[PDB]
């Protein structure tokens, strides 16, 4: 109560008209941080749900995503990370997402991407944006909030969701639950892999990832993971795909990426996956016109 109260409807209304004070954004970080810490690091969710991939500060595309998927609380949402960096409006993006998290804490969920770590967003845009528009102290407050984000989700005991992918260290879900917060993302280990690894159609088993961190994993790794944990699908993000979604290993894994025409280097669509109450899945594809 030491910073006073936010007027969250005012903040949301101003964000959708696309001008927050430093204390407003700080309040968004601190209150959402408390909510993240009150919920498990491995979320256990129920459908119906809309699942979204990377945003990377493309705020107008986020607004399009809500327009076509339904603004909260009309739909429930799970985002898979990478809200900031590269795009021009990381601040508006993460502020709107944190506002919805504060207002709908049981119907709106944000996972950690590899860019929700100071070691990464120091370099790829967010630090510079905070410093230009506000100050470094605000960026550090964001870091404190990011360090408490959940790292994976299981929807109805059948869909395993994370930003990056599998880990040769992941033997039990309890290993995920035992990760203590706040934490940064180290450059090796379970947490790293969940935020950084990729599927690869050419690899047999595990390979070294070209990013210089983590791993690649092949189709039999996916099949054995689903088998061992009695799951049906892995849903992850992290890699741009041409249609906004892309299947791997006979639809046992899907990659979602929600930023169209990604950072001006690609001509991709963005997509979100709609999961109804029976776990029937379909995709909504966002294509900007030329």
């Amino acid at each position: 109560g030491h910073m006073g109260s936010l007027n969250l409807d005012s903040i949301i209304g101003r964000l959708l008209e696309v001008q927050l004070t430093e204390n407003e954004i700080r309040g968004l970080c601190l209150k959402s941080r408390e909510i993240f810490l009150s919920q498990p690091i491995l979320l256990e969710l129920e459908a119906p749900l809309k699942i979204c991939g990377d945003i990377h500060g493309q705020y107008y595309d986020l607004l399009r995503l809500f327009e076509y998927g339904g603004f909260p609380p009309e739909s429930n949402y799970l985002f898979l990370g990478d809200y900031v960096d590269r795009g021009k409006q990381s601040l508006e993006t993460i502020c709107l997402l944190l506002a919805y998290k504060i207002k709908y804490p049981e119907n709106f969920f944000l996972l950690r991407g590899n860019h929700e770590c100071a070691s990464i967003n120091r370099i790829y845009g967010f630090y510079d944006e905070c410093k230009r528009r506000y100050n470094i102290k605000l960026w550090k407050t964001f870091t404190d909030c990011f360090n408490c984000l959940p790292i994976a989700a299981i929807v109805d005991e059948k869909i395993f969701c994370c930003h990056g992918g599998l880990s040769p260290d992941l033997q039990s879900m309890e290993q995920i639950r035992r990760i203590m917060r706040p934490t940064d993302v180290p450059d090796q280990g379970l947490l790293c892999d969940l935020l950084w690894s990729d599927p690869d159609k050419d690899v047999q088993g595990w390979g070294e990832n070209d990013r210089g961190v983590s791993f690649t994993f092949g189709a039999e790794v996916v099949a054995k993971f689903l088998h061992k944990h009695d799951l049906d699908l892995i849903c992850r993000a992290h890699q741009v795909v041409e249609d906004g979604y892309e299947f791997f290993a006979k639809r046992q894994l899907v990659t979602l990426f929600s930023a169209p025409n990604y950072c001006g280097e690609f001509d991709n669509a963005g997509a979100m996956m709609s999961v109804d109450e029976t776990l029937m899945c379909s995709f909504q594809i966002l294509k900007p016109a030329d």
Partner: peptide, 22 residues
């Protein structure tokens, strides 16, 4: 106990495409 099913395996559209003005 629920099972993941993709909509085109049930004779429905797998995708909807929203083309928007940039």
């Amino acid at each position: 106990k629920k099972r993941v099913v993709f909509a085109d395996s049930k004779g429905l559209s797998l995708t909807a495409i929203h083309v928007f003005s940039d």
